[PDB]
Write a protein that binds this ligand. Sequence first.
Ligand SMILES: NC(=O)c1ccc[n+]([C@@H]2O[C@H](COP(=O)([O-])OP(=O)(O)OC[C@H]3O[C@@H](n4cnc5c(N)ncnc54)[C@H](OP(=O)(O)O)[C@@H]3O)[C@@H](O)[C@H]2O)c1
Ligand SMILES: NC(=O)c1ccc[n+]([C@@H]2O[C@H](COP(=O)([O-])OP(=O)(O)OC[C@H]3O[C@@H](n4cnc5c(N)ncnc54)[C@H](OP(=O)(O)O)[C@@H]3O)[C@@H](O)[C@H]2O)c1
Lengths: 178, 370, 1098
Amino acid sequence: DARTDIENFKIGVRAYQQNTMKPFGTAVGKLLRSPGNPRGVPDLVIERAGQDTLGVSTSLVKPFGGRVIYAEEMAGRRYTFYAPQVWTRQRRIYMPSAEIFGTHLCNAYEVTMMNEMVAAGLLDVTEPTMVPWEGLPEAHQAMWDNRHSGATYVVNHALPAMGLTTKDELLEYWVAAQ
Amino acid sequence: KAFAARKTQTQSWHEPASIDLDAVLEDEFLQRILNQLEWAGRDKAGERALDAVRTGWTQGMTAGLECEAQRFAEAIIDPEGGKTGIQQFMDKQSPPLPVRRDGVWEDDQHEATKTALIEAGDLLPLGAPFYPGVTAIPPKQLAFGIARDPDTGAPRFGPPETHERELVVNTPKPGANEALIYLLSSEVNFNDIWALTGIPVSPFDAHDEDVQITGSGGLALVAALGSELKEEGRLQVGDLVSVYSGTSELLSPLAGDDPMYAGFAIQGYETKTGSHAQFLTVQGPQLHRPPADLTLEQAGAYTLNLGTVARCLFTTLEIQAGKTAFVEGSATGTGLDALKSSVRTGLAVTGLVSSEDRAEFVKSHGSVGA
Amino acid sequence: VINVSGHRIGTEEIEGAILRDKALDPNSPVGNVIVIGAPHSQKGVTPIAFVTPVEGRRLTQDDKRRLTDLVRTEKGAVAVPQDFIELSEFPETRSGKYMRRMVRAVVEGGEVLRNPESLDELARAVDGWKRRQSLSDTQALFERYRFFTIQYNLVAPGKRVATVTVKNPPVNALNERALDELVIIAEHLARKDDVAAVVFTGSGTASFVAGADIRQMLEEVNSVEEAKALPDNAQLAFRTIEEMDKPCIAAIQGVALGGGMEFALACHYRVAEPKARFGQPEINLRLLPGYGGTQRLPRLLADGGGETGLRDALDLILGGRAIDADAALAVGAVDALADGSDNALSHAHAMVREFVRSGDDSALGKAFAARKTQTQSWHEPASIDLDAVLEDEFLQRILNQLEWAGRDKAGERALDAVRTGWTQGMTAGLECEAQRFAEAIIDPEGGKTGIQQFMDKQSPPLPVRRDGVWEDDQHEATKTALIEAGDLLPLGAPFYPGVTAIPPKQLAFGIARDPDTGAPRFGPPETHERELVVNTPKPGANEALIYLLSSEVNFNDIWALTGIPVSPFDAHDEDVQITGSGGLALVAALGSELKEEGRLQVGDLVSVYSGTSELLSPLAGDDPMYAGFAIQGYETKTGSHAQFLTVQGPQLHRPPADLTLEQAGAYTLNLGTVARCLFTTLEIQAGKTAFVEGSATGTGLDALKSSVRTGLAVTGLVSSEDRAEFVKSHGSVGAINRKDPEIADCFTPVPDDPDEARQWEADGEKLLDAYRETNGGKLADYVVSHAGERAFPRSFQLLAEGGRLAFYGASSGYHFSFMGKGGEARPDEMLARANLRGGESVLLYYGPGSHELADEKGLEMVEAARLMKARMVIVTTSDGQREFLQSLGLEDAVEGIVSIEGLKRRLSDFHWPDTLPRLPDARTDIENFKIGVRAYQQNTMKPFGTAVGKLLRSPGNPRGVPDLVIERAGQDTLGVSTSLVKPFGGRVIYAEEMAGRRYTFYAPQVWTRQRRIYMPSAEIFGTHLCNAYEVTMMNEMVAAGLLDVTEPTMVPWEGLPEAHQAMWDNRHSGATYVVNHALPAMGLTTKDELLEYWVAAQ
Ligand SMILES: NC(=O)c1ccc[n+]([C@@H]2O[C@H](COP(=O)([O-])OP(=O)(O)OC[C@H]3O[C@@H](n4cnc5c(N)ncnc54)[C@H](OP(=O)(O)O)[C@@H]3O)[C@@H](O)[C@H]2O)c1
Ligand SMILES: NC(=O)c1ccc[n+]([C@@H]2O[C@H](COP(=O)([O-])OP(=O)(O)OC[C@H]3O[C@@H](n4cnc5c(N)ncnc54)[C@H](OP(=O)(O)O)[C@@H]3O)[C@@H](O)[C@H]2O)c1
């Protein structure tokens, strides 16, 4: 685990890449080379229920929509993969009766859609637990220790009072506080 | 003029220099480095370096160059030199280099520097009112994050409550597509912690700065705009805006597909600076108009957690009303935003918690169970 | 009873109006209401509305805003609550009665026993409220006028700075009331010793001040007394600012035009944004500068530039054209520009800061003392010979143009004002200017005509600028002169990026305005498309400069060159238009941000995509085509038919390497449009059939080959047998000759008489027999249309059951028509097809053709949309139909209803057409075509969209635009519905038997905004060009062989006009044309082969 022993964790990640993914991707890449796919990366992997190579396949398939499929019976077997390879690159695994879709943050257009839904009521902004500037380290630690005092934290930088709702209220309270 | 001047410059380098090399080497920081080289096993290389510097400095560049080449060839084949240093760099096990002069953060000198800069007009106190277009943008600012140890150069990672420190850093200048914003608040997200701790990846590996400021989101005022943002005419100095933390290659043809797939990076977590600071530079499309009916505490609180949940539920999963949904961590952060959002979408949402209080909490948000 | 500022009003009257929400909305969060008169600093007493909500309900700010407009519409704006205070409960007595006095006592602070503990919750809310009011009445930061805001800020312990911001929202125009406020503001701030300096600016990013209110000078000035008030008020404000004893900076963040330019000139220092533009367009309305322009502009520019300064000032007044900010600074009309991340307002305040700290040593203190001296000298006669300067030959070309455009008497008035002050002093000029301005306004042959023409879009052109004179006699002589010096490279000259100096002048093909009249010289390409000498552009931060080796020859060029149906000059302010959408070029220079990107490099061989968009908008992540999109060369001022060009980074692409140089920059516009049409819009599938218009040339050919290569049974429309053979040789199942005498006469629009229309449909029977004989009994599953008005109806008739037509053009005309296809469907299913989502805004027509209040299908549609959680507005025919619906308890579904009958009652000139009104072809009759379109917009759309919008406005849809329209087959309002529904994906759906009826709409409303129409048995999707990501997918498929570039028919530089005309006449000598600029040979395949053949030539 990267917490208890990070120097040996980094070595294991590198050995995986250098002795498995790089040699294997190179060989596959030479055969998939084409004017349409210069780097020779698979768009889709057909995995097989009778082995546990899913980590390699998710790590080799193209980033951002790369797909891995199973068609055979997977009952009674364990499969494994490296989590960041699927979510941070948003890769998809289609199985006969189940699907695992990686997802990572959002793009700026989806934010505008989100705020459109917040305006329309379809979404609801959880009211944050406000924290002073000095309380930020404690809020981080409270999250890390799973001792949340509320649903979600926000640090106050320069809000003169809580409850304000317009820019003009902000500036007005500032000149009043002096 | 330049070639004729350089001609006379080089021929003067063949004669001993008129500057005292020994005196400058007494500099406190140049000494800090030497001790750092000792700590990192490069003290021998340092000696060879200063030998060639000193040789050429007193016997002419020629005599120096001759010396430099011999030490370099010796250093390579040296079992304790290049054979160790190069293998170390190539196995990603190299000790850190020292910091730069402009990157020394010492705990005992922070509060003095803060107050001195505030005595001058060089740093605004925290919470200070800022009227865009009127208030002078200070050159310095306060912020939270991690810095490299001045003595060893290693990132001072650790538990947030003891290692996330308030620091005096520079106020950034926006590029042509960037805005400078004065932060009223900042989102407190878990990616802040992964960085501050260095688990499982060091944020310093993605940039070449001696300090890391985290922070992905918040409420801000527009303080300045790059030339192209003014051409766009969407934003305006003085606008109250919430911050979206995603950054991408806005000039890539691939933007039509998804900016997430065009050199994407989360600010504060995968960039040198973030929103846990007084001032921040952001790309244009990071700034948004908050929904009007929200309070100022609400406006800068949700764009990371709720934006992620929105993509997860409506883009990736494409959830269908009436269906069942199982959410982890349904009582805090993203889990709660997902719990709430799926309930409102019309699903039969069940939540996972680690306390009976949290189970009642999610049942009061419309869950069929906990 | 409360006395709201002497207005006696009962609290019950206010309470009742608030309670009406419960009678209008069965889901109202309002439960109980009490209204109290709370003490107010000035109003004396002001009504506060305490409300307890329904169980579980909260009182949103959208609710308070609705309950506020409710008292307004019911009683009056005087009886409006200042705030709405929510409470958990009211003081209830033994039995339940509400103790109004208890609440009144607490609010009023008086001495209130018989009831529960609610009393504490009131005080808490009254306390909180009474404190927000104290802060409002004591705040000294903002002074809020109707069209201005003053923001004070402490700079030194006794010196405040004042920021006066103009705010009249569309363009910050100054109407009379704003001049009234601006006088008071200037006089007040002048007397405040508290205020050390003043900074004027405008809100928003578009305009500082773009002029006086033009409509007001026409509709509210019917006498000289009324007219004289506008100069008199405006000049007094500007004189007050000018003569003030404090530095007054104009921070110009947008355009400063007309009165806004006169506003800035009144100030002591001027700092502007590089995007700001400046001018005096009053002459365009047969007026003149009336707020000081005829005095401060020639005086200011003459002090800076001597005789020439005066000349330059006469250019701006008599010509009336605007200049960019670099020119304004050069001539001396502004003093500084805010480069980089600096902005006008901050810059100004930094000058005030340095002035408070250094006084007269500051740059602002010197400018202020200097201006003082400057102003007083304007009050004496000027030293420059005016009559002599007016002998300048270009000033004469302007005067001769004013007579041509009917503005000579306006010019005479302006020179009179100029000359009066130039000889007698600013004061005499300002008096004469003011009188002449007011005389011109009321003058029937002046303002009354000019303003009318301007608003109705019937003004003649203004002259060209002094620097925009292209005379054909001069071209070849100027070209050689520039070439012989180091300023212009000969056409086809080698260019080694990073080595060859960039010439300042260049050659290009395009259209210039006539130097005598200012009218664009539109005409047939071979006679009117001309080679001109223009400037080599300079790239912006996100832009690149490229040296064009070849150039795509596309139809949009021709539409631009001929000014049909739209002038390319309406979208910019230059004196020359250059077309050209795509080509092959080298990279010559990269802006700061394209060097940061790292993708492009100086020297790269690249193909050009013609799409431009707001790269920095958040909406990029959706589709760049929906983020301020515009095609270069056609919808922008410059194009690729030139030596040099500037483009956005995303326009430049790496061509497939296995292509030749001729192909590389030859296909992107066409095949890219075809790509989005086939693979994105239609989503064509293998095994289906398809019908492709113009299959033998251009986009049609690209579509044919691409559809064949995806595995479809493509037949092509064709006009000559020789082309039908050519099309068949590309793997098609067949072709059809639209000119064959057996079917030629049937390719026409659908007549108005419904009986003729159904006969028209029969007359296409021979056509469908032809198609079917070649497709094993089947009709077209897909259709690609672009010919337009005279082929779309038949192309639609060729569709199969459940087929999908797309189109991206309409060469024959934009008046589209089609006979509906048999088939009925459920509103349920149709809204599903259109992917109706909860929260989207829907428009539904009720009682479409009749006055009978029963429309069973109409109610079914309401029920369908209601079940999908849709914000609905209903449009009925009559008031009886509207009142019929109001008894069906649809309040939880429809946000409102409006009847066409009601709009006709309230709007004399509102027109509801039975069908798209036919207009004269722009080819034949341009001016009357332009007149008819704006009649539709002004008398049909703008009224009907406003009424609908006001009922659909919500936070999620601030501008109240329908996301989808449920049309009705019994009417032909499709032109309205396609014009109203949001652009970029908007949808209209039919769910009823459309057979035997005609339906009409305006072509560009569907394709250029890519709106979709769903019908039971057919679908019409608009498509348009493509985004730069789709281009990467195109070249990707090209390299992979899934797509094939058609070899371009290469023509020389001198042949581009003929090549364009060949396309226009359908006299093609090949498939598509490309113009060669600097390709030394044909068959080259690498950049290094290009440069090596250049050296071999020299
Ligand atoms: N890819 C992205 O873009 C993105 C975006 C946002 C967040 N994240 C990541 O998602 C994770 C959550 O972030 P957050 O904002 O929601 O943090 P949070 O507010 O602190 O909540 C984390 C939740 O995890 C639950 N939890 C902890 N250990 C668990 C376990 N062994 N099994 C089940 N639940 C456990 C806890 O709930 P209970 O104890 O009640 O069960 C806790 O509420 C983080 O790792 C974050 O880095 C990623
Ligand atoms: N929306 C967009 O982005 C976009 C993009 C590209 C092009 N366009 C437009 O689509 C149209 C074609 O562009 P292009 O480059 O392909 O032009 P093109 O190369 O000149 O070909 C147009 C074809 O249309 C056919 N045609 C002319 N009149 C016809 C009629 N009354 N009925 C049926 N067919 C007729 C002709 O073939 P036959 O006469 O042999 O039958 C002709 O070959 C133009 O109007 C263009 O403005 C739009």
